[PDB]
């Protein structure tokens, strides 16, 4: 997260760190007792690496009573996701058992009504991604509040030049932004999950290249099918 602040520890009990061989790789969001949603590109060339999900965390490194590292029974990328596109960039991770719930670990309600978030709506995105251009990695969860950017602006040639489909949304990226390592994490608006940070390499903090988020409401039936 660029231009953000250290999050209040455990105030986002849905927040997941998706880890590969013990290192933070991507954000994710607990959406059911046994299921974490993230981005499909996260597991590109993950091969047979050990994929785990850390729940209940603030610090990646320090002991906390609510922190638990879960193994993953199933990783389910969206069938239409592809390495060279930003489309359908969702991943569902089935934990090896249902998560132990409490004040620091709780699924987030998620949007099923397929209607756009209004431009200017202030939404929260959190993550353990890089916090500066040097690539400094924070030990603890960071967050930033970002206004939703209208799709027409986001689609201007100067911005993302027609790439933003009805299944995607954008947020402003003027100094405050998601960045490398924040992919897969949640964009939350009014206490409901609306977006998942896409996992394509994108310059961070430049107003001319807004953040892109997959609209969870557009994939409601897919999320349901995988859980079933
Ligand atoms: C906006 N933005 C999104 C990008 N993509 C992206 O993050 N990923 C693609 C799928 C995997 C994930 C990733 O690279 N994770 C990763 C890798 C190494 C360390 C690490 O820990 C960390 F963050 F440094 F603390 C995290 C991305 C990449 C570059 C620039 C902007 C970028």
UniProtKB/Swiss-Prot annotation:
Its EC number is 3.4.21.46. It comes from Homo sapiens (Human). Residues 198-202 are annotated as: Self-inhibitor loop. Residues 1-228 form the Peptidase S1 domain. The gene is CFD. Belongs to the peptidase S1 family. The keyword Secreted applies. CDD domains: Tryp_SPc. InterPro entries: Peptidase_S1_PA (IPR009003), Peptidase_S1_PA_chymotrypsin (IPR043504), Peptidase_S1A (IPR001314), Trypsin_dom (IPR001254), TRYPSIN_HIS (IPR018114), TRYPSIN_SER (IPR033116). One of its GO terms (molecular function) is serine-type endopeptidase activity. Changing residue 183 to A: Abolished serine endopeptidase activity. This is Complement factor D. GO terms for biological process: complement activation; complement activation, alternative pathway; protein maturation; proteolysis; response to bacterium. GO terms for cellular component: extracellular exosome; extracellular region; extracellular space; ficolin-1-rich granule lumen; platelet alpha granule lumen; secretory granule lumen. Disulfide bonds join 26-42, 123-189, 154-170, 179-204. The keyword Transferase does not apply. Keywords: Complement alternate pathway, Disease variant, Disulfide bond, Hydrolase, Immunity, Innate immunity, Protease, Secreted, Serine protease, Signal, Zymogen. It is an enzyme of class 3 (hydrolase). The self-inhibition loop inihibits the serine protease activity in absence of factor B (CFB) substrate. PROSITE patterns: TRYPSIN_DOM (PS50240), TRYPSIN_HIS (PS00134), TRYPSIN_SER (PS00135). It catalyses: Selective cleavage of Arg-|-Lys bond in complement factor B when in complex with complement subcomponent C3b or with cobra venom factor. Changing residue 203 to A: Abolished ability to cleave CFB. Changing residue 157 to A: Abolished ability to cleave CFB. Serine protease that initiates the alternative pathway of the complement system, a cascade of proteins that leads to phagocytosis and breakdown of pathogens and signaling that strengthens the adaptive immune system. In contrast to other complement pathways (classical, lectin and GZMK) that are directly activated by pathogens or antigen-antibody complexes, the alternative complement pathway is initiated by the spontaneous hydrolysis of complement C3. It is linked to Complement factor D deficiency: An immunologic disorder characterized by increased susceptibility to bacterial infections, particularly Neisseria infections, due to a defect in the alternative complement pathway.
């Amino acid at each position: 997260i660029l231009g953000g602040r250290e999050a209040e520890a455990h105030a986002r009990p849905y927040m997941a760190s998706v880890q590969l061989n013990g290192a933070h790789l991507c954000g994710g969001v607990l959406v059911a007792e046994q299921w974490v949603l993230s981005a499909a590109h996260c597991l590109e060339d993950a091969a047979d690496g050990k994929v785990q999900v850390l729940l209940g965390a603030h610090s990646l490194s320090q002991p906390e009573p609510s922190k638990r590292l879960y193994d993953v029974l199933r990783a389910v990328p969206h069938p239409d996701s592809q390495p060279d596109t930003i489309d359908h960039d969702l991943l569902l991770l089935q934990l090896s058992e249902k998560a132990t719930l409490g004040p620091a670990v709780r699924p987030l309600p998620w949007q099923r009504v397929d209607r756009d978030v209004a431009p200017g709506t202030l939404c929260d995105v959190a993550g353990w991604g890089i916090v500066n251009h040097a690539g400094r990695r924070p030990d603890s969860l960071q967050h930033v509040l970002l206004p939703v950017l209208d799709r027409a602006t986001c689609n201007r040639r100067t911005h993302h030049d027609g790439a933003i489909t009805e299944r995607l949304m954008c947020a402003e990226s003027n100094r405050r932004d998601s960045c490398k390592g924040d992919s897969g994490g949640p964009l939350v608006c009014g206490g409901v999950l609306e977006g998942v940070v896409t996992s394509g390499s994108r310059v961070c903090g430049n107003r001319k290249k807004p953040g892109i988020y997959t609209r969870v409401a557009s994939y409601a039936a897919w999320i349901d099918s995988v859980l079933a």
